[PDB]
Structure formats: structure tokens, C-alpha cells
Amino acid sequence: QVHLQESGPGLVKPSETLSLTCNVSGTLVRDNYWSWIRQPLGKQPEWIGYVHDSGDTNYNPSLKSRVHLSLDKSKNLVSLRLTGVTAADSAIYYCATTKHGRRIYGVVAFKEWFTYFYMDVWGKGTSVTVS
């Protein structure tokens, strides 16, 4: 059983840097894809980006310039850093593992397929308010 325990500042001010930590337990951070999800209250969730080893990291285009993701293999932690926080960034943030697979519709040799991702293990999340 993998447990994802999140922590963070709770309250940050406008234009500051928000830095959240996911404490990974029951698995090592290096063997999983990690992703972050945020859910503004009353809204459906948004996928921020995902991070993994071998450079397989990607970001939500609207946050690409503001968000940085990394994995600390010495501490077994997943880091999430968001800069220039505004009122719109108040949300419940979540740490989750990510699994992946492939949907094939045509000829594989012509790359008529795509990778898809899903989130099986979710943490409890943390509530972040931007003053």
C-alpha cells in the first residue's frame, strides 16, 4: 500500500512561491510516475503536470512557465513548485501516482497510437490559500 502524505505552507501571499511536498511511503519515488492535481473549490480538478525519471516530465501549457516538478531520490519526496501565485491558485492540491498505457488504433509502425495516463493512488491533499 502506497501512502502519499502531503504538506505545505497552507497560506501564501500573492506573487510568492508555493512549494508543496509529497512524502512518499510504501514505494520509491524513482519507480513511479508522479503527478499533481489541483481542485479549486466547487470546480472539477486540473492536471498540473507529471514528472518521472528519464526526462519524462510534462506540464499543463498554462502553467508551464510557472511550475517546476522534481523527484528527490534521497528523501523519497515529490516536489511541486508554483511561482507568481494569485487568487486563482487557491485550491486543494493533490499528490498522486500515475500509471500509463497505450491506445492503439492503427499501424504501430506509423505511430497510429497514443499514450494515456491515469491516477490510481491519491493522497489526502492539502488546502492552499493565496492571500
Added chain:
Amino acid sequence: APTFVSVAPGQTARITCGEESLGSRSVIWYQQRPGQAPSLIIYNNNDRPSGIPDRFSGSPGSTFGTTATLTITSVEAGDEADYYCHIWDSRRPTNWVFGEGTTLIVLSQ
């Protein structure tokens, strides 16, 4: 944001998501209990992960021109949650957001 539907206990719920498919799809369905992080119900259109019962199934991704559908048969009190949907489509850019979900109301509490 959410659509509201309701069923009596024991009835089948029909939950829909997104716009009409354009190409082959891989629809992923999630469930959120109020106050809790969401979890996965179905991935790859109809493959449920271990721990999810047979009453939860979905529409195929092999068709065109229709929306995603989640079917929950024999709905119980434990199924009162928001259902969210994340859709991948071969002719569309990656969706970095979830579509608006549906609140499933279970009656006669």
C-alpha cells in the same frame, strides 16, 4: 459546474461526459466522495482496477459521434459521489483538465 441526476436505491444511473468523440478514445472515469480525494473507477473505457465491482462499466471508445457514458447498475448509498471524466481522443490535443462531472444523488436516505 456539475450536472445533477438522481436515482432510487437499486436503480441504474446514467452519467455522461464531454462532447462527441471525434476519433478513437480512451476515457477515464473517477469518483469523488465529498471531502475526499478522488479515485479511479474505470480506465481505458471499460477496464476497472482491482477493488471496483462489476456494477461499474462504461461505453466503448470504438465509436464516433457520441459522448462518454458511465453506467452504474444497482446504485447504492455508497455510490453518492461526484463522477468526473477525463477524455483522451486521437484527433484532439491532450486534455489537461477534467470535464465537468455529474453529481449522483441517491434517494430515500
Added chain:
Amino acid sequence: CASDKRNVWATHACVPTDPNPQEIVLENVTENFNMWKNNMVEQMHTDIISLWDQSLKPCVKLTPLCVTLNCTNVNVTNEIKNCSFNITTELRDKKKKVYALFYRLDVVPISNYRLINCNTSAITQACPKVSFEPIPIHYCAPAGFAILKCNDKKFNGTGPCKNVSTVQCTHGIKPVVSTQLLLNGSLAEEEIIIRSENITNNAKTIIVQLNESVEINCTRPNNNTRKSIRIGPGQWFYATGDIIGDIRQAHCNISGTKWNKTLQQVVKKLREHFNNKTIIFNPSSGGDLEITTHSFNCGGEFFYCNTSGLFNSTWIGDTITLPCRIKQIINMWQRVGQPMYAPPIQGKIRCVSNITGLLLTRDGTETFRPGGGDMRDNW
């Protein structure tokens, strides 16, 4: 001719066939044949061009479409452009904006694009009711003349034939059009026969006839829809409408094992004209799409396929998939200035053809490449 709706080669400009063709064996007759000096080839070539041109006369020209197009890819993919443009209607004082999908190969950039032939000639669309399925045509002699047939099993292109029969006329020949591989022709009876005018030149083509066919499975997987646009007073244009489902690339499938056996045999017989040298095969060396790729008409669509997956090997003492492209504006028989527009065909397309031969050329170890766009060599 002798042959037996509205097929492009069924103009009824000539007679029906003899239900019971005759052939007379001439005992003790030796005759010198030469396929390279055979004027029946020129006759067939001319008749085919004529039938094609006659069949395309009674239909709509697309000169009203030579306007600037506004093209994007907004709803196509995550080769095909979504273009909007203005057209006329049956009322000369009115114009409307319409949309159509076009293949990239038919559209050239200059309000961004133009059709590829608008600065050179008029594009005529294929008459929509006319199919392009080959119909066997028999060529028959007039009074005072006779056609002699050679029956030597190992006969190549030239020389004396020791078994000559007289026929009223030829077998039916299907006017199949292709550029690198020969399709749906006759097979050799005992062995692969290599025919050339001069096997030792580099200026001449080599026609290789197989004694066993190889199947090629071709498909156009996109579920294209057809949309009919009114240009004028009974003048209709057929545009590609939207595409249902995934966008996939057209392709052809050749069995790996038959292809390799075929080459072992082609090389084995090539080494009988060449010394025992290493033989290699390479992709066509250059030129435009018509020559560098293998083209064919499959169900009315014009395919161009990449054959580099076949002609890539070295010979010394699973399934192959060929990607393809589709075009709607074509210029057949190297006639520059006479483009034709093939209307899109509704639904998916599949066809199975027989590779019955190859067209090869030599580079100045011997090197062979597929090629020859001169239709007289197919005939």
C-alpha cells in the same frame, strides 16, 4: 477493338468479341518476332489515350474554383487541410463561402493557398459516374491481315519462334496503369523471364515477368465522406467532406516470404546475363512522385506508394508495409497542362492486386532500381 455503367474504357467506339475465338497452329513455320519493334504497342498506347480523353469531355470544369483558399488544420489532427473559399452559385450575382478538405499534395502556398494547377491549365473533374476499372480489350485484324502468336515457353523479347499460331485476334488485355510494379498481367509459364532490348545497356529498361504472382493488399482506411457543391447551372463539384473517425495513413501489404523468394529467383535469372557479380537493389533515384513511387488506381483513388521497403537488398553468390499517399489532381501519361480532378470516394477502400512483374533499370557490383514511367513498357 473487340470487347464486352459508363466505364471510362467502354465508349462503344468499337465491336463485341467473338464468343468462340479461333487459333490455327502453323506446323513447320518459323517466324522472327521483336517486341521492341512491335507497332501494336504504339497502336494500343494511342487508343488508350483517346478513350481516356473522350470519356472526360462531357463534364464539369473546375476553373471557377481557382480562387485563393484559406486553409488550416484546426479540426483535423491533434497531410490534410481544411480550406474555406468563395464560390459562385447558379445566380451570377451571388457568392457563398464553402468548406472542403484537400490533400496537401494538391495545394500550393501563394488567404494562403491556391490549387496546384491554376496558373498552368484548366482542371477537369472526372465525370462522377465513370469508373476506372480496367476492361480487357482484344485487338483484332482487318481484312487482308493476320496476327501471328508466338508459343515458345522460354521466348524472351526477340528472335525466331518455332511454334507460331494464327489467331483472329489477341487475348483481352487489361489497360492497367502502374509505375513500378506491373499488376494483374499474365504470368510466365515455366520460369521468370527477363526481357530487355539490350541487357547490357543502361539506357534500356528491363521487364521482368514472374511465373508466380505476389499479392498486394492496399487500403485507404479513412472514412471519408462526400459533399456535393453547386458551382453553377447543373455544374456540381464533389468535395471531400469531413472524416469520420481516426486519421490513418494509406498503405499496402506484401508478404515478406513471397517477396524474398521472388527476389531470389529474379536474381538467379539475372546472374545468367550478368557475370557472377554482387547484385544490389536500391530505391528509385529521383524525379517527381509519379516516377519515384509506385502508383495505381484502386477503386477510383490514386495511390502513390513508397517501395523503398522492397528494393533494398544485397545478393551474393512477416509482412512488409508500404506507406502511401493519395492525390486528387493528376496528370497522366506525362501530359503537362492536362490535369484531372478525381472526386473523393465515399467510404473505405480496399483492393487486392496481383504483382505479376517488375520494371527495372540499371545505374551506369551491379545496381538495379525500380522505374520507368513510360506506359508503353507496360503494354
Added chain:
Amino acid sequence: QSLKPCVKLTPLCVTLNCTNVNVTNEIKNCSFNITTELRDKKKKVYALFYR
């Protein structure tokens, strides 16, 4: 027969603006609008014509 397979000049039946500004101190310098290979475009061109 020899004149059948070639260009008609009916597209040139337009009004011409003609002068003699750079011809002499018989032949007119005329400007006019024509079509191009693009049906929605027109351009102004010049030509000399005999009177």
C-alpha cells in the same frame, strides 16, 4: 483550323485609359485592368496599341 487551338481576347474587352505621354515629342499608351489566374484578383497593366 490553325487558329482554333489558342487564346481568345474577350477578357480584354474593357475600357482603356490611353495617352501619348511617353511616345512622341499613331501609337497609344493604354492602361487597363485584367484578370489573373486567381479569379478574385485584378491588376492594372500597360500596353501600346496602334491607333
